[PDB]
RNA sequence: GUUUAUUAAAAACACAGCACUGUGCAAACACGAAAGUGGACGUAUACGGUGUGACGCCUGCCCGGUGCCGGAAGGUUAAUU
RNA sequence: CUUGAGUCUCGUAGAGGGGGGUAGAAUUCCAGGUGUAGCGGUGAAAUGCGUAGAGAUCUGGAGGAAUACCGGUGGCGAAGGCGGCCCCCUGGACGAAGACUGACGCUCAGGUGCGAAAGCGUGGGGAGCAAACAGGAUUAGAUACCCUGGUAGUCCACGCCGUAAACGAUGUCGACUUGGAGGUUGUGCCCUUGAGGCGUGGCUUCCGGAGCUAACGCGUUAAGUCGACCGCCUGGGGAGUAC
């Protein structure tokens, strides 16, 4: 498989869904013969610019390792989900853990 | 062309040109849900809107709206339906049901296909506009919540919404500019019908035109009576509209219900 | 440096205009300059850092 | 570019932002573009910067 | 007769002319000036000391309220990015923040070929 | 390019011994794979020429090797062209 | 291919192609005092009207006149009070 | 047989290519608020836009093209060329311990393929720019330069056309031959205590010695000393024209 690192920022007034969103994704990854060696909840915070309006959003990281196939399934559930304002996921670059 | 598969092009042998045929829909012969079809253009007496004739027809076929809901359809096979170039697919539900539908693009071989509020957003089945994102590409909507009219002309025919419009009304037909429509309505969401299906030329009247409609051409033809212009030594001069229709644009459709659509430019 | 979360060690390689500071006044071994800029770009999407300044 | 100071005075601080953009990347645009004229004059003016 | 108290002032600094409008906080026109309208026209304007007399004319149309303080919005290059702010500092007005709102794209549209003599 | 679990795999199928990544029988065969596999890639995109240049490279480069075998051990040639379904 | 059945078969009508224009569906348009019907069990890759008449290379300047399209601030102006 | 050439391993840098996404700045346009007699343009001017309310300003929306800063005397590519961020498919180059094959190589008429821009066909798209075209100005005239507009086109797909001062005006491959300063990327090593210091490969700038050269200049990336193969030249005009 190939490592990853996805940081999704969900709408500020939908934070309560963030915790639930994590379980789904995480569960899938685990059920995809993958691994999760990084995780952190940044919560809400001011933005550089009012990206997609407002001036704050909920941040979360990841840095998985699951097979590209199953992660490509994420872009869909990510797009078709007004909760999440912006999506941004880079490639492997070898397992990343702690710090951040 | 620009896609797959390209459209054959008959070679100069006996004044021959572009044709029309698909990749295939394996079989050459339909199901059973169909009527008999009317015949000519005439209105219980007089012709009415001249032009209209030629034989070869039958085959009604159906389905629209899609009252049925969350029950998994499976595309049985694409199929060719007369007069309207928008294919048709077949489709069977998980309870031996069998409507028809307007064959979207990526279809054929089985596929998902689901209707009802909250359903996979691909090109499966209709869905209340409400339960739809931007729908840069919806489908044969309905001016009303229950019907299925709109752009059934699938063939390349699309419609764009506007991400999230409130007030419960949106849509952007092709040349129809802008126009609001009850949001409690549903759209197939697929929105296709293959464009090239309408990218060949009939050929040479007869075996291509006649097999549909009569000589829809009358021109001046002179004879100041048969049409609001004629005679002359051999030319036209003046106005040439039939029944002072005034072919100089004019436009129509005034007052009454509707006419609450928007934007609409004039180039 | 190869990231964007380390927003802490970036505000130095910019200015009141959030513009990527040249390598002239940095001499950041070049090879690093390349990486340093790449971060400031992608990092701006996560609104972690600003693009312009007037808005 | 963002100024702001306490104790009313028209000192300046303004020409400080006048070193990153300002009338430069402005007139840079002004008229037409460049295309080949730059990649060339940009690589010739570089020769100047030698001595 | 509204008494906006404080409102930013846009300084459309251009070459062939310069104009400053003392709009309100939200961005409503309260009083605008203009070099072309400041006696001298043709092209004699432009020059900084010519725009200063222009924007200063606002303290004659926007003075009907009582602007006790105001910011400054300088847009576009030309002889009127400094002059204006200066004349305003003497007119009696205050100041809250100076800034350049000149439209600096990122290689978007392709500027006009133009000029070639 | 090619995956190790595959490259280091095939080598142990044509090598007249062990870890003989040099052997023509090996290298040559190793080329057909990356070639056949790319044919599915070039089926898509098409316009991607800069990648075909390398494709053609390994193709001719492969042939340069086949001619060699014929000029070093007639048998080995016809004995390998089959295991790879070559010649077409 | 069509045409003056019974003096004209043609260079005329048609044609496929092209263009302009109109029509958001209870469509425009047509038959009809109306109901209703055709257009179409079609829905802008669709339907109508006008002109040109494969195909090739093309299709220049004029918006003063008339017509049409947009604006509609101001002038003139019906019934009505 | 192994040093040429190639394979394997493990790393490294990259605007190499094809596909799909996505972001922010700006322009234009549509709508509405504020506000009022100018705006725009030039050397001046005028056309043009403005009291039917522009310009300015602010709010919302639509759309297309290109990606400031980083950006460099930089990098990648056979050439043409290739700059936002992200993912997917993919090519080449280089270094190092090495392990492997064993001359499998160099060049290449004909042949096949790739080719800036402009242009062509079908269908899309169209913000800005802009051949044509139309006004205004300049002038002796001005079928121009300048100004106000503006269509094809520029953008996308797919197919065609094959040209450019397609330039290093310098064919590809290999071996030799004083030096100096620098750039970029790999690797070994050094109280690795450091920015760092010493080597050893790739690619690349500038100066320059011998030599070469008609001179300018080229000068280890040669236009120096040699070897292998290919393309080409034989006075100017007529003519890259006629057939
Ligand atoms: Mg007649
Ligand atoms: Mg007669
Ligand atoms: Mg008559
Ligand atoms: Mg011009
Ligand atoms: Mg005949
Ligand atoms: Mg007769
Ligand atoms: Mg006769
Ligand atoms: Mg005719
Ligand atoms: Mg190179
Ligand atoms: Mg082109
Ligand atoms: Mg074209
Ligand atoms: Mg030299």
What does it look like?
Chain F: Keywords: Ribonucleoprotein, Ribosomal protein, RNA-binding, rRNA-binding. Chain F: One of its GO terms (biological process) is translation. Chain F: This is Small ribosomal subunit protein uS15. This is part of a larger assembly, with chains A (100 residues), B (267 residues), C (55 residues), D (51 residues), E (117 residues) and F (88 residues). By secondary structure, chain B is mostly loops. Chain B folds into 3 domains: 1-111, OB fold (Dihydrolipoamide Acetyltransferase, E2P) (Beta Barrel); 115-192, no CATH class; 193-267, Ribosomal protein L2, domain 3. Helix content of chain B is 0%, strand content 1%. Chain B has strands at residues 73-74, 92-93. Chain B has a two-stranded antiparallel sheet with strand order 1-2. With 55 residues, chain C is an all-alpha fold. Chain C has one domain (1-55). Chain C is built from 1 helix and no strands. The longest helix of chain C is centred in the last third of the chain and has 15 residues, at 31-45. Chain C starts with 30 loop residues before the first helix and ends in a 10-residue tail after the last helix. In chain D, 35% of the residues lie in helices and 0% in strands. Chain D has 51 residues and is mainly α. Chain D has helices at 22-25, 27-30, 36-41, 45-48. Chain E is of the alpha/beta class and 117 residues long. Chain E has a 4-stranded mixed beta sheet, with helices on one face. Classes of the chains: A alpha+beta (100), B little secondary structure (267), C mainly alpha (55), D mainly alpha (51), E alpha/beta (117), F mainly alpha (88). At the D-E interface, helix 1 and helix 2 of D face helix 2 and strand 4 of E. The complex binds magnesium ion (12 copies). One magnesium ion binds at residues 224, 228 of chain B. Chain B binds 2 RNA strands through loops.
């Amino acid at each position: 498989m190939r490592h990853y690192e996805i940081v999704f920022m969900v709408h500020p007034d939908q934070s309560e869904q963030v915790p639930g969103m994590i379980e789904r994704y995480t569960a899938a990854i685990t059920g995809a013969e993958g691994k999760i060696h990084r995780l952190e909840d940044w919560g809400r915070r001011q933005l550089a610019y009012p990206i997609n309006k407002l001036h704050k959003a909920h941040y979360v990281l990841m840095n998985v390792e699951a097979p590209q196939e199953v992660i490509d399934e994420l872009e869909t559930t990510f797009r078709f989900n007004d909760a999440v304002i912006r999506s941004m996921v880079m490639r492997t670059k070898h397992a990343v853990t702690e710090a951040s | 062309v620009k896609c797959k598969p390209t459209s054959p092009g008959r070679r100069h042998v006996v004044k021959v040109v572009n044709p029309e045929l698909h990749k295939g829909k394996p079989f050459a012969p339909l199901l059973e849900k169909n009527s008999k079809s009317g015949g000519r253009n005439n209105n219980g007496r007089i012709t009415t809107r001249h032009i209209g004739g030629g034989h070869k027809q039958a085959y009604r076929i159906v389905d629209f709206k899609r009252n049925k809901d969350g029950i998994p359809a499976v595309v049985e096979r694409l199929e060719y339906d007369p007069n309207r170039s928008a294919n048709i697919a077949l489709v069977l539900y998980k309870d031996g049901e069998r409507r028809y539908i307007l064959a979207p693009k990526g279809l054929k071989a089985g596929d998902q296909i689901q209707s009802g509020v909250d359903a996979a957003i691909k090109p499966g089945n209709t869905l209340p506009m409400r339960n739809i994102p931007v729908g840069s590409t919806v489908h044969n909507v309905e001016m009303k919540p229950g019907k299925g009219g709109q752009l059934a002309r699938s063939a390349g025919t699309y419609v764009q919404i506007v991400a999230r419009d409130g007030a419960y009304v949106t849509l952007r037909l092709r040349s129809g500019e802008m126009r609001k429509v009850e949001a409690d309505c549903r759209a197939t969401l697929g929105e296709v019908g293959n464009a090239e299906h309408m990218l060949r030329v009939l050929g040479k009247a007869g075996a291509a035109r006649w097999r549909g409609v009569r000589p829809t051409v009358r021109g001046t033809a002179m004879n100041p009576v048969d049409h609001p212009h004629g005679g002359g030594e051999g030319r036209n001069f003046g106005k040439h509209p039939v029944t002072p229709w005034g072919v100089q644009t004019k436009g129509k459709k005034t007052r009454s219900n509707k006419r609450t659509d928007k934007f609409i430019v004039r180039r | 440096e190869i990231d964007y979360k380390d927003i802490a060690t970036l505000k130095n390689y910019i200015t009141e205009s959030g513009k990527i500071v040249p390598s002239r006044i940095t001499g950041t071994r070049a090879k690093y300059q390349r990486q340093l800029a790449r971060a400031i770009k992608r990092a701006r999407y996560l609104s972690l850092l600003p693009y312009t300044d007037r808005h | 570019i963002k100024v702001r100071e306490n104790e009313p005075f028209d000192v300046a601080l303004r020409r400080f932002k006048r070193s990153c953009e300002k009338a430069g990347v402005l007139a840079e645009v002004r008229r037409r573009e460049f295309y080949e004229k730059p990649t060339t004059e940009r690589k010739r003016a570089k020769a100047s910067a030698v001595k | 007769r509204k008494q906006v108290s404080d409102g930013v002032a846009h300084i459309h600094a251009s070459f062939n002319n310069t104009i400053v409008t003392i709009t309100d906080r939200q961005g409503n026109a309260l009083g605008w000036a203009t070099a072309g309208g400041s006696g001298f026209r043709g092209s004699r304007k432009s020059t900084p000391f010519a725009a200063q007399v222009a924007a200063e004319r606002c303290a004659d149309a926007v003075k009907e309220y009582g602007i006790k303080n105001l910011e400054v919005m300088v847009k576009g290059p030309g002889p009127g990015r400094e002059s204006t702010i200066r004349a305003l500092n003497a007119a009696g007005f205050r100041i809250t923040n100076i800034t350049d709102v000149t439209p600096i794209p990122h290689n978007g549209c392709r500027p006009p070929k133009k000029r070639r003599v | 390019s090619l995956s190790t679990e595959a490259t280091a795999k095939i080598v142990s199928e044509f090598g007249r011994d062990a870890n003989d990544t040099g052997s023509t029988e090996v290298q040559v065969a190793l080329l057909t794979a990356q070639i056949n596999h790319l044919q599915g890639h070039f089926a898509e995109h098409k316009k991607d020429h800069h990648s075909r240049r390398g494709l053609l490279r390994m193709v001719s480069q492969r042939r340069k090797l086949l001619d060699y075998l014929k000029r070093k051990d007639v048998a080995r040639y016809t004995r390998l062209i089959e295991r790879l379904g070559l010649r077409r």
